[PDB]
Amino acid sequence: VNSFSGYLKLTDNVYIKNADIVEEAKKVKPTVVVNAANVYLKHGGGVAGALNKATNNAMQVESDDYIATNGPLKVGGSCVLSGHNLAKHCLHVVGPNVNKGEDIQLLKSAYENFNQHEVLLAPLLSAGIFGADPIHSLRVCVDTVRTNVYLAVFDKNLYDKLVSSFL
Ligand SMILES: O=C(O)Cc1noc2ccccc12
């Protein structure tokens, strides 16, 4: 038994809810929140801009130190940093950005990072401002992630569409 409430169960391990991921993290304080990061950890908008704003820019300060030491992530890769006031940890995961012409096949690699964590609160990777088809992102999530994932869909009509079209 964990602290997540109100989710629709899609599979043995994947759950979904229409939610603002910033408000859900603040309420639950999960072990792991996933950020929809870019390779530079520049948290300007979408999930990253919203998560970073909720940390009063502390996420960006920590991220800039990480990049100054390590250089950029890979598309499909991740790093674990502080969750600040939102979570114990933040798993910054880079899905491909369709708008940058990045290979959609890297979405599966991105979701494989979730398997290193028993339970996660997450967005649909490459959805929203990343430009991928969110229905595809949910299919890759279900077919890739084996650990327990609680998905936060920001858009209502998208949430209702994801549910109603789920195989
Ligand atoms: O609903 C999401 O979580 C991201 C998203 N994916 O696609 C959308 C379209 C409009 C607004 C938001 C979105």
How many CB atoms lie under 10 A from the CB of residue 61?
12
From the CB of 123, is ligand 1 less than 6 Å away? Answer: yes
- Give the residue whose CA is nearest to atom 2 of ligand 1: 154
Task: For residue 36, give the nearest of 51, 24, 47, 25 by alpha carbon.
Answer: 47
Spacing, Cα 70 to ligand 1 middle (Å): 31
Is 59 within 8 Å of 72 (Cβ atoms)? no
Could you give the CA distance from residue 118 to residue 101 in angstroms, rounded to a whole number? 32
Task: For residue 119, give the nearest of 151, 143, 96 by alpha carbon.
Answer: 151
Residue burial 77-106, b: 16+ Cβ < 10 Å; e: rest = bbbebebbebbebbbbbbbbbeeeebebeb
